[PDB]
């Protein structure tokens, strides 16, 4: 009854392609919201003292994503990376990502 802290981990699965081409995996390929590498979701461990509450990672289709959980972008060059993501695939989009989440908890007592 001391309660627990909760935290939802969030990581992004990234893919790219050439216009009109097939999607493939980035070098990093898992990152956070802004582009920094993290490990593949399935290899991600809780910090010391925490445990997973959700049995599985999940991807939330109520967000602005397509029916498989992807949002899409393109780099608009003055910029160095994608900045604005959208739910619909268009043939000239070169980047896409899928947001995966999983709840963990830490008991206070």
Numbering used by the authors: 943 to 1051
Article passage:
Mutations in dysferlin, the first protein linked with the cell membrane repair mechanism, causes a group of muscular dystrophies called dysferlinopathies. Dysferlin, a member of the ferlin protein family, is a type II anchored membrane protein with a single C terminal helix buried in the membrane. One DysF domain is inserted into the other DysF domain, by gene duplication, forming an inner DysF domain and a two part (N terminal and C terminal) outer DysF domain.
The structure was solved by molecular replacement with the NMR structure of the inner DysF of myoferlin. Except where stated otherwise the analysis is based on the single chain in the 1.9 Å structure. The inner DysF domain construct starts at residue Met942 and ends at Gln1052 and has a Ser on the N terminus from the TEV protease site. The analysis shows that in fact there is not one continuous stack, but three on one face of the sheet. The three most frequent mutations disrupt the R/W stacks and are likely to lead to a less stable or possibly unfolded domain.
